[PDB]
């Protein structure tokens, strides 16, 4: 519809002015499946990984905040088995107003700070409060091997 408008404006946006870290990678036939690429942040377990995700504004878009899902095996308390991340905040305090790079951001700083109280992955919320050294280890080492 005239969405399709305001996000090709935004999309073409994040191609051309993309964050740092963050490479855009939309098929012009599809704008609803983003293909997305995320740095691993330094100083994080993540540092040095490529992490392949997909945003997929859903139906009820951008009344309701889009679904992300990371397509690179990671260890992350808000990221389901099926790859799902879960950004509660996106979800509690989502407004239209928040362009998808505001997602894509936010995602990038769950990577940096999990939320272990929402957490999609058990073991590794309990491992970031529990024994982080723990969780950071596996982390870094699920990195090196899916980054």
């Given at each position: 519809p005239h969405i399709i408008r305001l996000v090709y404006k935004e999309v073409t946006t994040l191609t051309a002015?993309?964050?740092?870290g963050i490479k855009v990678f939309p098929n012009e036939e599809d704008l609803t499946d983003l293909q997305v690429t995320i740095e691993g942040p330094e100083?994080?377990?993540?540092?040095?990984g490529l992490f392949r995700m997909k945003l997929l504004l859903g139906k009820d878009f951008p009344a309701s905040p889009p679904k992300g899902y990371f397509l690179t095996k990671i260890f992350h308390?808000?990221?389901?088995?099926?790859?799902e991340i879960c950004v509660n905040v996106l979800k509690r305090?989502?407004?239209?107003?928040?362009g998808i790079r505001h997602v894509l951001l936010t995602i990038k700083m769950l990577l940096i700070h999990p939320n272990?109280?929402?957490?999609?992955?058990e073991e590794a919320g309990r491992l970031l409060l529990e024994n982080y050294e723990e969780y950071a280890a596996r982390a870094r080492l699920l990195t090196e091997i899916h980054g």
């Open positions: 002015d993309p964050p740092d100083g994080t377990p993540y540092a040095g308390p808000n990221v389901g088995a099926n790859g305090d989502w407004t239209a107003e928040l272990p109280e929402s957490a999609l992955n």
